[PDB]
Write a protein that binds this ligand. Structure first.
Ligand SMILES: O=C(O)c1ccc(F)cc1C(=O)O
Length: 436
């Protein structure tokens, strides 16, 4: 696998569907490196559970938790961590209203080098138990020898781009990690970093983050093909924000416009994949899986137009149709879904807060949140396109798409999962209804 894209282990599927999956205990195992220090960037943490996922011999090594909590939530997190003298915390600034520290990333410093893990799971038991989640594992990056002057940079600019992402926090604990990264050789990295950080970006900075970052990379490092208007866009996510009163306000005007960019020189089909109520009810977790699919009735009722874009969750290819998705992915398949022009795994949901919204007569991109993902482009692997792998766990130049293509449209009786209304008509796989 050149791609190093993994799913998390799912309890309850046959072993064939976890052969090649990773649990958090595997990621932190001594087989991956002799841990010296780690940083855990996330949204939600269960600290007692998290420490138990580290090998016993590594449980006292320094851990930095990077989070966005304020006020009582911040106090609760500090209270969770206080029994562990080796745990430090970094509160990421969220100076624009309604922002979230959503990025899920591990920085793992070893005696042997450094590893970066960019993934989709919160650091709680339920997120690694019966969900579909995605992981990108970096190579083991060796240390640059003291006295040697080299950039350690990759053709995708990943080292500088990761440092730039961390610099945006303006945090002393993260400057320490910046200095660690500077000392390592990241040149083998074949993915492009796509981050969001809170702010109002103009001029040159507009291409640094969010959907304009994606657009810039696709303009510079992808090529248009004949009949590009027939290559769909697919977005797949676990949460939906307020997108406006119709598709022209944001979804099709700026979001889709960035995602359909190819090369330097619209009828494009847009497929959005989001679990139906039936997908949740019949899932391994049952209705409680919907606690991790935040879409509120107050938001949904203002944008019923959006639901005509929605397609069911189906993942026979990876044995995961009943493992509800908390992964987020975006990609550009060919008209027959046999190839893809690129693939992105990210924390970013279908949200203006995550991807950015244009302001000031189109001159400023405003982002509310921290997000992070990695983009797989054929050019970074010496290819014009990626073949789609037919079975996720079954020539290595085929990309492992973790759900089924083509996506299947909701049926007339299907409805999107909305987390804060009751479902009391049919019981779930555990015999229960949903009463928020
Ligand atoms: O899990 C998360 O970090 C998360 C936090 C807040 C949300 F509104 C949505 C999500 C999601 O990713 O589904």
């Amino acid at each position: 696998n050149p791609f190093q894209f993994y799913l998390t282990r799912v309890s309850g599927v046959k072993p064939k569907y976890n052969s090649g999956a990773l649990h958090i205990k595997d990621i932190l195992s001594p087989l991956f490196g002799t841990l010296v220090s780690s940083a855990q960037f996330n949204y939600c943490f269960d600290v007692d559970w998290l420490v138990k996922q580290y090998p016993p011999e590594f449980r006292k090594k320094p851990i930095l938790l990077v989070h966005g909590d304020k006020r009582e939530a911040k106090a609760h997190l500090h209270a969770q961590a206080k029994p562990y003298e080796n745990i430090s915390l970094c509160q990421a600034k969220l100076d624009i209203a309604f922002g979230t520290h959503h990025t899920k990333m591990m920085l793992l410093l070893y005696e042997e080098g450094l590893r970066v893990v960019i993934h989709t799971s919160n650091l709680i038991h339920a997120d690694w138990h019966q969900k579909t989640q995605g992981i990108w594992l970096s190579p083991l990056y060796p240390r640059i020898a003291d006295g040697t002057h080299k950039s350690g940079e990759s053709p995708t600019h990943f080292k500088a781009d990761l440092i730039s992402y961390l610099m945006a926090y303006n945090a002393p604990s993260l400057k320490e990690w910046i200095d660690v990264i500077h000392k390592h050789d990241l040149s083998e990295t074949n993915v492009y970093l796509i981050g969001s950080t809170p702010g109002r970006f103009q001029g040159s900075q507009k291409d640094n983050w969010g959907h304009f970052r994606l657009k810039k990379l696709l303009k510079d490092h992808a090529s248009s093909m004949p009949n590009a208007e027939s290559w769909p866009v697919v977005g797949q996510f676990s949460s939906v924000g307020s997108l406006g009163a119709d598709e022209s306000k944001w979804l099709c005007s700026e979001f889709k416009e960035s995602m359909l960019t190819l090369g330097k020189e619209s009828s494009v089909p847009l497929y959005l994949i989001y679990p139906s109520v039936e997908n949740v009810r019949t899932s391994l977790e049952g209705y409680p899986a919907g606690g991790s699919l935040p879409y509120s009735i107050q938001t949904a009722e203002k944008q019923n137009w959006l639901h005509s874009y929605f397609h069911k969750w189906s993942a026979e290819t990876s044995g995961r149709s009943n493992a509800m998705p908390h992964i987020k992915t975006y990609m550009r398949p060919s008209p027959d879904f046999s190839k893809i022009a690129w693939f992105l795994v990210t924390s970013a949901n279908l949200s203006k807060a995550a991807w950015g919204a244009l302001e000031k007569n189109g001159t400023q991109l405003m982002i509310r949140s921290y997000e992070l993902g990695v983009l797989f482009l054929p050019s970074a692997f010496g290819l014009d396109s990626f073949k789609v792998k037919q079975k996720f766990f079954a020539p290595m130049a085929t990309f492992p798409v973790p759900y089924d293509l083509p996506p299947e449209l909701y049926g007339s009786k299907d409805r999107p999962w909305i987390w804060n209304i009751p479902y009391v008509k049919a019981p779930d796989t555990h015999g229960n209804m949903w009463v928020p």
